[PDB]
Design a binder for this molecule. Sequence first.
Ligand SMILES: N[C@@H](Cc1ccccc1)C(=O)O
Ligand SMILES: [Co+2]
Ligand SMILES: [Co+2]
Lengths: 380, 380
Amino acid sequence: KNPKSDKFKVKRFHHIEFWCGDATNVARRFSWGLGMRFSAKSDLSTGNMVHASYLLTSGDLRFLFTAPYSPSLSAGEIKPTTTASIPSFDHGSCRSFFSSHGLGVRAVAIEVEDAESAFSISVANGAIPSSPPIVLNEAVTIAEVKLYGDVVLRYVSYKAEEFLPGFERVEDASSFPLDYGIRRLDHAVGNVPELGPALTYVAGFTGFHQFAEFGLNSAVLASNDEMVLLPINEPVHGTKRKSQIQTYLEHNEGAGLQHLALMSEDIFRTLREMRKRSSIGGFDFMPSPPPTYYQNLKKRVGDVLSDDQIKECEELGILVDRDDQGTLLQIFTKPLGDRPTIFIEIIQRVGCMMYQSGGCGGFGKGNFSELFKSIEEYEK
Amino acid sequence: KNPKSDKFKVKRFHHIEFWCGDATNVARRFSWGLGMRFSAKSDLSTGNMVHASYLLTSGDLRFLFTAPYSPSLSAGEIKPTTTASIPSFDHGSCRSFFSSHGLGVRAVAIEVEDAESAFSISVANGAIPSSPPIVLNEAVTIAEVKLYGDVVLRYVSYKAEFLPGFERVEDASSFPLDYGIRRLDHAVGNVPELGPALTYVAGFTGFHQFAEFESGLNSAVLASNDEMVLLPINEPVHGTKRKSQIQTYLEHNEGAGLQHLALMSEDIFRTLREMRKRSSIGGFDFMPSPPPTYYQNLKKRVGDVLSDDQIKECEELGILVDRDDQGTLLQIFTKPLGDRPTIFIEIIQRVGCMMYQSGGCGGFGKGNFSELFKSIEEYE
Ligand SMILES: N[C@@H](Cc1ccccc1)C(=O)O
Ligand SMILES: [Co+2]
Ligand SMILES: [Co+2]
């Protein structure tokens, strides 16, 4: 049941911004590992004496990597005379974030009809303001409110119908057209110490509604058309094995973004391409489930995948779960950096064809049961 | 002439340690871009709750990449009970280094016969102590003195993997890349004043000035007894038409530090082919190629050393060639390794001075300043 109670006009996920120590090395690693193209830059070569920012794109997916230069380069500037292309940037905020959290997501950005309006209604509805609406070259408006921890939900709106003003397109020579099938951001998942207040706060200022489905507790906030999806986890203390949400909070120094789910238009090509590169600069994957798991998928999704595609799931380590309206293919990378905090999920959804409706197949809630049952039958 | 005035026994370059914000991402980018294998780790998975350190190797070349975890993980520890594998590591020193300089070299490590004596005689002879000698598992001794800026010269000695507490990387995770890079040839620092820098360093090491043979800078080279440890030092020349890039280094780096690392390849042509293949898919970019006239003038000076077939290969790969009276030098420079116009890498191969090859054979390319200004005027 979808009340469609959005308090302002939300369109889609627009980009994800990583705050880094060195944007160059993180970005080049991510480009190779994920098959994303360098598509825009704002840095010393574009006149930006404040921060270095490099944009990777794959389909509609936009990963932005930003790091601070020495404040001495911009010591003479003031906010009216700034050369930063992203006016919310702050040297001290950025260095604090990185030293506290390590490599991680600073902004979950959604496009909206009117960023100034979305900021005002949000703050009027309990949102903690982070950066006030600022209009960039009379073309784009951007505004920020706190989401959880030091993560901000960023509103961006365009008068027109090129990422942001001040960013230049990167030269063809430095833009090799990598592509492993990733097409768009499906959802972004946060970890917090307690679920209730985080939900009450975010649902409070957005009007996002709870999305139904079927060592943690979780719930998913969703926009009107359920294309902006924001699950949130809290830890369940007392279990035999220590909750990984708790281990997240410990290594991240509190709440933050836990993982990003990237939709692929062909999850088999994506996993083949990423797994080719795991040990030559790309990303590692979580240990595959036992073949037990895969023997039992026939009874579950033999309706939906052939024996060959089930066998191909076993090669790549893919997981499969299923709602009452669709089926979900998913796999999880290992942590993206030094700490056991942020990781990436690759997914592909099958079913619920209207285009495809959001969250088709759910988010993998069934795979807790099927993992313990598969590990218990592989031991036998 | 060479007085062999080393004040303690110095063997070879042992490793170079980068101080990072995230060691994983820098290390994986460097591994792909340079063709270096992952060979040892010290991190959470090895019991290290303080720092994450990852070692890449190519031949004898050792690149160590280190970043701090959250201090909270090691709050109960004291130096006697530390789990850091590198006892000189300090959270606050590391974060201060990285926020001041960005990505850069913290330690230039040379192996010596006895690290304690090397430290003792060093500070006895004016060296500013950085970390006193510490004996690692009764096997390795480690000591550090200040070199220039926030860079330290690190002494390592073995009584008999990399260091105690570093584990070998699982072969599944250790893919055997190799583009021909074999060892560290020399390491170059930029300082605001050359004279006092040389006086200091030559002062406490006993290294002697290595003899070589209007634009840029002034520089000089300190060398160990057998001239295998080579440390050039630069200072800017102010007042010129074009900004001294030593001066631009100092500004963007917030003062003195390591400018570039020169890596010896056993086949510069293969190395440059392999690196240039990956420039746009996660690797390193190279400085603009010299004009074709630079290569037309190569026959008159090195036609005696390289065939037309080897001179043509130099021009497609952008390699530069210089020559003193004892040997011939092939060299090329990368673009900066990260966000700031500070540290970069040089690939080199030396031709001649066999008796082994003796150090510095062919010089360091000082003649390429006259030949680059010439060629630009001829191609006009
Ligand atoms: N002049 C130093 C290093 C350097 C190289 C290139 C540019 C500036 C400085 C040398 O001995 O090679
Ligand atoms: Co998910
Ligand atoms: Co050099």
